[PDB]
Write a protein that binds this ligand. Structure first.
Ligand SMILES: *O[C@H]1[C@@H](O)[C@H](n2cnc3c(N)ncnc32)O[C@@H]1COP(=O)(O)OP(=O)(O)OP(=O)(O)O
Lengths: 172, 276, 234
RNA sequence: UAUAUUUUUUUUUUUUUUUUUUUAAAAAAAAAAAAAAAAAAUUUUU
């Protein structure tokens, strides 16, 4: 794969990255080549709103950080306005927060998008994105307030398994 | 149905191309992405693949290497193109990435002495057209006569050797062809000569002809599929009306700066047919 | 996020074992690159993960009255195991460098190999040598520092008298420079008269071994070679 | 001697210094800094 990370399309690249994420290898040259190729492909829109989640999750779990790649992925997700649903938005936030050693002005824009996706989401993504925003380290008074306002309706759906995360994020 | 293009190099792109007019480096990059979007929407090509970056700007000509006439391919002869042969190697990879090697034009590349250029050979319904001029020899026409020729009531295929002057551009540049018996031609001396030469051959073709003002770059492909669309430069307005009056939908694209560079529609993309 | 049981190899018999090249004592992963160790081998003096075997006479034992030799597992001194691993790596390095036929050099440096805090995966303290070896060979969260003292100079002069050292060069002042470039890197040693008399590439780290002692003085064994270059450009 | 990028073209606001004019105060210009903003720049022979 290392010598063939250049001659691939989008689907092959995302499939190969997803396959290599789970194994646990840390070949640096392969990851650099695939990051370049992803950056080159993301210049002109060539990723549907289903492979960005896979790429971000695989890179975040792989424990590899790059400002340029994540910026390009965020920009491409930003271009496809109204196409990404909440069910396809929360995992991106989780993946970006798992590598939370980042800079502001990125979670700032993600706060704006989260405003209109609070209505049609259940308690699981509520707690998960709440922990993610807590790990971002930026005080979002209005976002936290609206999350608190909307969270009380689905208090019945709380299975008490993920109550620990939403309780611990406040302490965080 | 497979189309290949190459992104330009921003650092080594030269201003003031070989016509005495300066160019804007940023404007090329700005226009290339819109060209990509138009190409991938214009429904003339099934797939578009983005080739990697290379330093030489003369490498932006993805074509002039390898021509698709049918299920098989034909590589171009190595004559004066050795200085960039290396990058040619890379191109093939992308082709083989999603396609087979076909015949590798062993019969064409190794044909003793060869002088061929992508654009001298243009396909047509039950026909092939070779622009015999300062770029193509008669040996190539004889080889195509040997290879791509069949003659019967239903196995009907023909080859037309078209004469042109020394100063004429390559055949596929000016006079092209679009599906459903529509033939596009420049309204200059070269186009009139080509139309007359075609008319003297096979009078039973019944091919309607539409004229365009000279100096217009357009892309149109026969293809296994049938489609009514053409790609035209967003310059001369009268050509759009002239071609739309015949029932063909035109699509405008901007190529001012790349025209000053000297890059045509034929060499901007690489059409290919991939089968199983 | 926001094997360990099998690390000791106890919960079964890993199928397809022992059918691999003898690279147990070193970490080898599959061209010129500076600051890129091609073979890492961590070592220690107090702790050594190697057991030994020895012969015995079991004739007394009730039932083994017909066998004269029987092997038993005995622990071994760490220094002998360290020496065995060192020579096992050294023969491999010698064969490799002979096959490549590069100009061979060997360095034994004195200094401290100070590591970084991020080495400890899982934020644990006690871990087997294997895992720390893999972590060092993969992430490289370490840095080498060379330092000595002036007060021992006369002392090691006694070592000279102990080892009949002979002076081949006195105190010399040299201006080391790193003549970098946009494509490759190079180095030079300006003399007192200030001219460039050598032109060469940076050293290629082919094998690194850290011998850590209990106290301050630690040892670093390095095998490095220099790739050839046409003298025209030089 | 196992932490690679640094950033950049251009618009808005604020602060500091200098020259000029007028009545300690106001305005234009030059230089510097800070904040913000639109937009752009990476480097493999199986
Ligand atoms: O060990 C290195 C290092 O301490 C220092 N050095 C060289 N190049 C360096 C860069 N780019 N960054 C930081 N430090 C650097 O100098 C030595 C190089 O070797 P040196 O001490 O001069 O002598 P030695 O290894 O015995 O033999 P050389 O041929 O390498 O000089």
């Amino acid at each position: 794969a290392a010598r063939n990370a250049k001659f691939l399309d989008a689907k092959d690249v995302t499939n190969i990255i997803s396959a290599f994420s789970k194994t646990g290898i840390n070949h640096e040259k392969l990851f650099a080549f695939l990051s370049r190729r992803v950056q080159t492909l993301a210049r002109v829109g060539e990723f549907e709103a289903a492979h960005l989640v896979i790429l971000a999750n695989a890179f975040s779990r792989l424990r590899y950080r790059d400002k340029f790649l994540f910026g390009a992925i965020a920009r491409r997700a930003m271009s496809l306005r109204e196409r990404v649903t909440v069910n396809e938005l929360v995992p991106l936030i989780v993946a970006f927060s798992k590598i939370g050693l980042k800079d502001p002005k990125l979670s700032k824009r993600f706060a704006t998008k989260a405003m209109e996706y609070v209505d049609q989401m259940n308690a699981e993504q509520v707690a998960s994105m709440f922990m993610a925003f807590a790990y971002f380290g930026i005080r979002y008074d209005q976002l936290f307030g609206v999350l608190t306002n909307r969270a009380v309706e689905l208090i019945d759906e709380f299975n008490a398994q993920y109550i620990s995360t939403t309780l611990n994020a406040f302490q965080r | 149905l497979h189309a290949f293009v190459r992104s330009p190099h921003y650092r080594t792109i030269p201003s003031a191309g070989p016509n005495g007019i300066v160019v804007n480096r940023d404007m090329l990059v700005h226009q290339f992405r819109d060209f990509y979007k138009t190409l991938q929407h214009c429904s003339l090509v099934d797939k578009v693949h983005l080739m990697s970056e290379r330093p030489s700007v003369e490498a932006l000509r993805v074509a002039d290497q390898m021509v698709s006439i049918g299920a098989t391919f034909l590589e171009m002869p190595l004559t004066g193109m050795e200085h960039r042969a290396t990058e040619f190697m890379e191109s093939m990879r992308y082709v083989r990435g999603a396609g087979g090697p076909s015949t590798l034009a062993s019969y064409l590349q190794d044909t003793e002495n060869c002088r061929c250029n992508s654009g001298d050979v243009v396909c047509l319904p039950n026909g092939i057209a070779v622009g015999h001029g300062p770029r193509t020899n008669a040996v190539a026409h004889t080889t195509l006569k040997q290879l791509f020729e069949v003659k019967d009531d239903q196995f009907s295929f023909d080859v037309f050797t078209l004469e042109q002057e020394g100063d004429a551009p390559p055949l596929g540049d000016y006079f092209g062809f679009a599906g459903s018996n529509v033939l596009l031609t420049w309204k200059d001396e070269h186009g009139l000569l080509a139309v007359d030469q075609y008319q003297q051959k096979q009078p039973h073709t019944e091919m309607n002809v539409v004229y365009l003002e000279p100096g217009c770059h357009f892309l149109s492909f026969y293809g296994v599929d049938h489609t009514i669309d053409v790609l035209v430069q967003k310059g001369y307005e009268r050509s759009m009306d002239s071609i739309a009056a015949a029932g063909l939908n035109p699509i405008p694209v901007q190529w001012s700066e790349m025209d000053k560079l000297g890059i045509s529609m034929r060499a901007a993309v690489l059409p290919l047919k991939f089968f199983k | 996020d926001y094997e360990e049981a099998d690390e000791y190899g106890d919960w079964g018999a890993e199928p397809g074992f022992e059918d691999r090249r003898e690279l147990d004592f070193m970490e080898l992963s599959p061209r010129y690159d500076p600051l890129s160790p091609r073979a890492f081998q961590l070592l220690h003096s107090e702790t050594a993960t190697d057991v030994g075997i020895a012969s015995i006479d079991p004739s007394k034992l009730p039932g083994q009255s017909k066998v004269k030799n029987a092997l038993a597992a005995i622990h071994v001194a760490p220094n002998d195991a360290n020496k065995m691993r060192f020579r096992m790596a050294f023969e491999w390095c010698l064969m490799n460098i002979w096959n490549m036929n590069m100009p061979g050099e060997l360095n034994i440096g004195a200094g401290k190999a100070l590591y970084y805090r991020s080495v400890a995966k899982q934020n644990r303290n006690v871990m087997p040598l294997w895992t720390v070896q893999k972590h060092l060979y993969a992430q490289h969260p370490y840095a080498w520092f060379a330092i000595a003292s002036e007060s021992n100079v006369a002392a090691m002069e006694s070592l000279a008298a102990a080892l009949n050292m002979s002076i081949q060069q006195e105190r010399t002042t040299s201006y080391k420079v790193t003549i970098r470039r946009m494509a490759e890197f190079f180095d030079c040693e300006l003399n007192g008269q200030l001219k460039c008399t050598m032109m060469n590439k940076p050293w290629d780290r082919f094998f690194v071994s850290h011998y850590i002692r209990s106290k301050m003085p630690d040892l670093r064994y390095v095998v490095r070679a220099r790739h050839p270059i046409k003298k025209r450009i030089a």
